[PDB]
């Protein structure tokens, strides 16, 4: 790797600079280099890793959706050649490459070394998320297996989070939010999505009384996203 000669602490420092400059591809490359040093990541470092790759894949997903919509309109009327499909495929392949990179970091060896609930749930949620992004573009004989891989990662994360974290924990809430999106948008299970969002919101509501002002703000921000989805879905 091109980051093999840079100090771990320097990679982290530069990832933070890249974030300030909105240079998310650089940020992701720095954080990949930091992961590959082989040490476990702190809470701050895990969040840097997620912010970096979420922004990279977010731009790719937005572009893929634009190109996929153009391609769909083209197949309704004048023939324009292979260019739309070719370019959609180019963006899709780069998206899949980023997802494979993230999944590879989780598999070598972030998940297997993560013993505390906060780290393990965070990484398993990420695994579900990046399989979900792969599922968004999957169309062939592997769509079912990709969907099953996302479901399995989310389910393992859910089981740990329910046993080890309070219902207001932001990681637990964000996991439940994303698993509900998986059910609605990927798994053709809107009723499961709605039930999960409702139960998650209500259990968090009942635990808010235990929280400080700052933790209350952290939890209610995610709870509002669950409510926004319920409003969209019902």
């Amino acid at each position: 790797g091109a980051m093999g000669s840079m100090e771990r602490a320097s990679l982290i420092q530069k990832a933070k600079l890249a974030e300030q400059a909105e240079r998310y591809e650089d940020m992701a490359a720095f954080m990949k280099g930091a992961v590959e040093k082989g040490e476990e990541l702190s809470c701050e470092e895990r969040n840097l890793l997620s912010v970096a790759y979420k922004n990279v894949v977010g731009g790719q997903r937005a572009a893929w959706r634009v190109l996929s919509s153009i391609e769909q309109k083209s197949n309704e009327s004048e023939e324009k050649g292979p260019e739309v499909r070719e370019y959609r495929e180019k963006v899709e392949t780069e998206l899949q490459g980023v997802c494979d990179t993230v999944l590879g970091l989780l598999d070598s060896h972030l998940i297997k070394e993560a013993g505390d609930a906060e780290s393990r749930v965070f990484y398993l949620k990420m695994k579900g998320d990046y399989y979900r992004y792969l599922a968004e573009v999957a169309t062939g004989d592997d769509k079912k297996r990709i969907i099953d891989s996302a479901r399995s990662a989310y389910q393992e994360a859910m089981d740990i989070s329910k046993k080890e974290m309070p219902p207001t924990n932001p990681i637990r809430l964000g996991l439940a939010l994303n698993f509900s999106v998986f059910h609605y948008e990927i798994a053709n299970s809107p009723e499961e999505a709605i039930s999960l969002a409702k139960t998650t919101f209500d259990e968090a509501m009942a635990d808010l009384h235990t929280l400080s002002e700052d933790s209350y703000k952290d939890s209610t921000l995610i709870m509002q996203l669950l409510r926004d989805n319920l409003t969209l879905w019902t």
Binding site: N47, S50, V51, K54, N55, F122, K125, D129, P170, I171, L173, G174, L175, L177, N178, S180, V181, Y184, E185, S215, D218, L221, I222, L225, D228, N229, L232, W233
Partner: peptide
């Protein structure tokens, strides 16, 4: 499209 989680989670 539904909302998914922010990348930063406390």
């Amino acid at each position: 499209r539904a909302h998914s989680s922010p990348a930063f989670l406390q």
